[PDB]
Subunit: 115 residues, 3 copies
């Protein structure tokens, strides 16, 4: 079972790292907990609760992966002395799409619920 | 950053153009059918996910290309891995639409 | 070009096979994924519930694949360069963790409403 505790350790190291270093990530965590609270407090069916939570967590996932990519790029540029933000742009685009997905999700779901 | 990368992906990646077309089409079609909110959301999200994953994969490909002009086993592995991730997102999207529309 | 699709699919399967052979976590999570997918196709639930149960778990697959790609990039860099903070690897590990947590939460909320 050791590999599991090692991996989870790496995961918490990463999460704490992202929380301390990235402001947008802190905002996204706030967004997740708020999402759960709102979804559970509102009298809402299971699929919709799930969707309201998942759509927001997806943002966190994509943000983390993006941050990983940014880190790789930064190591490169540190040793490379050449910079092109192609990758960073693409990642940020991905995160944007995730956010738009969450807003659409919440719009449709909450609009239906309060109809 | 954002619109820069999106414009980049549209101009360069063909699969991304096809995915954008697929996304907007999916939006229209999801809004046309008389389905519930959860269904609509799933129909849209499933397609948007493909776009997201394709974008991340494209970022990875960019990094790999920047690292070295020469091809290496690990660099190739990375690309292949990213291509695999995109594949799964598509299958999921397909499965999503199938379960939903068959039920409808 | 219609052939482009089959080329990209070839790359894709090459990557799936690569991930399965080299990455163990991908194998185990793959077992849990396939199990979950099978179970979802036999549960007496609505389309939305089934799609949710399946997709939530396939997300784990996708994120693990991306994490593996990133790890491959870091491993590539580590041959040329000597020091590695492994911060990127940690971030990816975090992403996978969040994906899994999402899957579990999804299954709990869904099945506790279903069976409950």
């Amino acid at each position: 079972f050791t590999r599991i505790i090692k991996a989870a350790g790496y995961s918490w190291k990463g999460l704490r790292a992202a929380w301390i270093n990235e402001a947008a990530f802190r905002q996204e965590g706030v967004a997740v907990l708020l999402a759960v609270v709102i979804a559970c407090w509102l009298d809402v069916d299971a699929c919709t609760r799930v969707l309201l939570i998942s759509s927001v967590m997806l943002v966190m996932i994509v943000e983390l992966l993006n941050s990983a990519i940014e880190a790789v790029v930064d190591r490169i540029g540190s040793e490379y002395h050449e910079l092109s933000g192609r990758a960073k742009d693409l990642g940020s685009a991905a995160v944007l799409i995730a956010i738009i997905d969450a807003v659409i999700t919440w719009c449709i779901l909450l609009w239906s619920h309060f109809g």
